[PDB]
Design a protein around this ligand. Structure first.
Ligand SMILES: O=C(O)CN(CCN(CC(=O)O)Cc1ccccc1O)Cc1ccccc1
Ligand SMILES: [Cl-]
Ligand SMILES: [Fe+2]
Length: 497
């Protein structure tokens, strides 16, 4: 009644606050809390820190912490505990290279039980927003460190947050209960069970049978034809949010033939995205023209969409010397076919479905796209080392878009650096991305984001496909289901059956 059952494709993991997969970002956020909390307006509010000041140069920050917070095991949260957590995360600094605050923090010390001082290398504007992310800058009770560190594992996953992990059964379920000694508001729901159900169809069946009360997730949550049917079923409740992030292809500028601007521009006119969404996504998502939607901060730039126009795609290819051999449908230039490999996760039906549309659309303009559907690990290896022609990719949602997504483009083991590696202006873009993050001058900040996103758009590095939404299917008795400000969090504490 005040207990709900839901599902997730895998277990939540050990819930080490400072590490990554197999820990799940939404479950880390249930147990662990940040110094400051992200809000839908892009600001942060006081959270475990009640207030803060910064030096004139923007480099030294002092937070005054709450004094009434306890970890769920009764141990105090105080500045020493916070400082030991920062030391634990930065004792594994290289693992957090993707997040620029991990390279910016020069020192963290507790000045007293309530005063915590953080010194940075530069006036890093996204500081507070970085501290608000699900990981790694949360807080586990230091008693639960293993040999005074977390990077080699933790003991019990003891946080300060509104949920406590009750128990986990690998490949079966995870059970959380509400923290009866939480410092903030008590959740209405007392117990949440997560059934581990990896397949989307099996998740929809589990809901139809009543085995689960709630499904919450992105466009991969359940089959979208089924979701549309459920939205008309008066026994159920469904929701579809406003878009949270972009799904796009990344095109390899460093690999023939996507190394040619004219080829990438042509590809960007070849796909009818509205058709793709109505055909493969059941009409449930929005067309994307631009790496970031115009509603994203700093990204309303009047960039010019490449609308579906196969006549233009062909013209661009022909002018570039890619013409059709007698009796053949695939173009050739300097003897070579216009062949491009598109890699995706082979077991993800929706990805496959999507890939097949893209392949068909680009044969219509004389490009031979070859589908390479592989297991997850192999696709992640291809992202990291640039072994792809085109690969599916997506942005990260608030509060990561755009600043953290752009920051990451500089990390060589990420798909975006690899896709961009062939650009003459790659070093200028990376220099500009470092500059934009440390700008105090609001005018210069906007000008640097315009230049970076305009170069990425004009160089046709991406093929934006969709802005996708978060979707919910629920038993009606749970009521309206809220969304969280951070796109990877699930706001269970806000559900009030
Ligand atoms: O991982 C995070 O905390 C955030 N992630 C930080 C980078 N990741 C570091 C890693 O996972 O090792 C590696 C990473 C790189 C490229 C795409 C996805 C990734 O998870 C990005 C993210 C944001 C929102 C939703 C999903 C992923
Ligand atoms: Cl619908
Ligand atoms: Fe990640």
């Amino acid at each position: 009644p005040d207990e709900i059952t839901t599902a997730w494709p895998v277990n939540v993991g050990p819930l080490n606050p400072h590490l990554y997969t197999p820990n799940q970002m939404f479950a880390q956020s249930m147990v662990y809390e940040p110094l400051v909390k992200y809000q839908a307006d892009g600001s942060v509010i006081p959270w475990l820190a009640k207030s803060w000041t910064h030096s004139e140069d923007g480099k030294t920050w002092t937070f005054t912490l709450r004094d009434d917070v306890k970890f769920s095991n009764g141990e105090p949260f105080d500045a020493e505990a916070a400082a030991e957590n920062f030391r634990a995360v930065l004792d594994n600094r290289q693992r957090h290279a993707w997040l620029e605050l991990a390279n910016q923090i020069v020192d963290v010390k507790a000045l007293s039980k309530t005063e915590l001082q953080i010194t940075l290398k530069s006036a890093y504007y996204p500081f507070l927003q970085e501290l608000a992310l699900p990981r790694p800058f949360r807080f586990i009770a230091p008693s639960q460190f293993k040999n005074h560190e977390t990077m080699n594992g933790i003991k019990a996953p003891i946080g300060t947050g509104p949920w406590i992990l009750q128990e986990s059964k690998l490949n079966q379920y995870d059970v959380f209960v509400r923290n009866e000694n939480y410092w903030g508001e008590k959740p209405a729901i007392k117990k949440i069970t997560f059934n581990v159900i990896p397949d989307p169809t099996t998740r929809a069946v589990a809901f139809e049978t009543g085995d689960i009360d709630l499904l919450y997730g992105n466009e991969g949550l359940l089959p979208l034809d089924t979701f549309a049917r459920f939205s008309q079923n008066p026994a159920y409740h469904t929701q579809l949010s406003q878009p949270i992030e972009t799904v796009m292809l990344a095109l390899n500028t460093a690999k023939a033939p996507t190394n040619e601007l004219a080829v990438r521009e042509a590809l960007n006119y070849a796909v009818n995205k509205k058709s793709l969404i109505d055909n493969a996504l059941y009409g449930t998502q929005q067309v994307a023209d631009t790496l970031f939607a115009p509603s994203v901060p700093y990204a309303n730039l009047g960039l010019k969409p490449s609308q579906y126009d196969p006549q233009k795609a062909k013209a661009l290819l022909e002018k570039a010397g890619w013409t059709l051999p007698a009796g053949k449908d695939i173009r050739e230039k300097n003897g070579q076919p216009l062949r491009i490999e598109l890699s995706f996760i082979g077991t993800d039906a929706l990805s496959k479905s999507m890939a097949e549309i893209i392949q068909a659309d680009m044969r219509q303009i004389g490009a031979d796209v070859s589908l390479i559907g592989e297991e997850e690990s192999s696709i992640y290896a291809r992202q990291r080392d640039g072994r792809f022609g085109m690969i599916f990719h997506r942005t990260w949602g608030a509060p990561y878009d755009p600043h953290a997504f752009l920051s990451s483009m500089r990390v060589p083991s990420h798909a975006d650096f690899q896709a961009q590696q062939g650009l003459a202006d790659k070093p200028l873009i990376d220099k500009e991305i470092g500059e934009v993050l440390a700008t105090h001058d609001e005018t210069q900040r906007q000008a640097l984001y315009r230049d970076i996103l305009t170069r990425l758009h004009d160089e046709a590095v991406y093929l934006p496909i969709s802005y996708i939404s978060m979707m919910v299917v629920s038993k009606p008795e749970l009521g309206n289901i809220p969304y969280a400000p951070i796109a990877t969090e699930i706001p269970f504490e806000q559900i009030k059956p």
